[PDB]
Amino acid sequence: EQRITLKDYAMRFGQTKTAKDLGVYQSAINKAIHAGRKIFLTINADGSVYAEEVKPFPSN
Amino acid sequence: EQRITLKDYAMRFGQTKTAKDLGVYQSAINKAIHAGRKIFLTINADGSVYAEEVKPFPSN
DNA sequence: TGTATCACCCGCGGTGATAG
DNA sequence: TGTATCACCCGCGGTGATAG
């Protein structure tokens, strides 16, 4: 609430802001996205963001 | 259904079987567990297992 | 239907192993 | 409220940078 996708979020906001919102470098995002990582953002009232990723175990 | 925790599963079954069930080496498990990784198994009728892990983005 | 190291290599997450 | 490389280091996931 709102639960939204990284990619998604990225298309709305632009790699940079996003990236900035997670306190990480833009290239990350990019990579991450192209990467096809399953990740989700969570927005809070204030607009702070939280992101978790889903991955299969085991990583290999 | 059933949704169960790795650790959990591990306590019921013993590191080894588990490990075997995921097609990975026992030490992994161990590590993984001690590691405090958030991971979950999913059991199916037949008893096949599937495991996904939850992680914060970004990994760093 | 034991677990917990250990060093090795592509620093996490694995591998094999070795023991117990 | 541009994105997409690139080489570098602790092979994935990041960093900075460089450009466009």
Swiss-Prot record, chains A, B:
Annotated SUPFAM superfamilies: lambda repressor-like DNA-binding domains
Record's keyword annotation contains DNA-binding: yes
Keywords: DNA-binding, Early protein, Latency-replication decision, Repressor, Transcription, Transcription regulation, Viral latency, Viral latency initiation and maintenance
Source superkingdom: Viruses
One matching Pfam family: Cro
Substitution effect: A32W: Loss of dimerization
Gene Ontology biological-process annotations: latency-replication decision; negative regulation of transcription by competitive promoter binding; negative regulation of viral transcription; release from viral latency; response to UV
InterPro entries attached to this UniProt entry: Cro-like (IPR000655), Cro_sf (IPR038202), Lambda_DNA-bd_dom_sf (IPR010982)
GO MF annotation: an example: protein homodimerization activity
Residue spans binding DNA: 15-34
Protein's job: Plays an essential role in the switch from lysogenic to lytic state and in fine-tuning the lytic phase activation. Mediates the de-repression of the lytic promoters from repression by cI at an early stage of prophage induction. Turns down the expression of the transcriptional activator cII, a factor that initiates the expression of repressor cI, the major component promoting latency. Additionally, cro is able to directly bind to the promoter region of cI thereby preventing the transcription of cI repressor.
Assembly and interaction partners: Binds DNA as a homodimer.
Protein name: Regulatory protein cro
Species: Escherichia phage lambda
Gene: cro
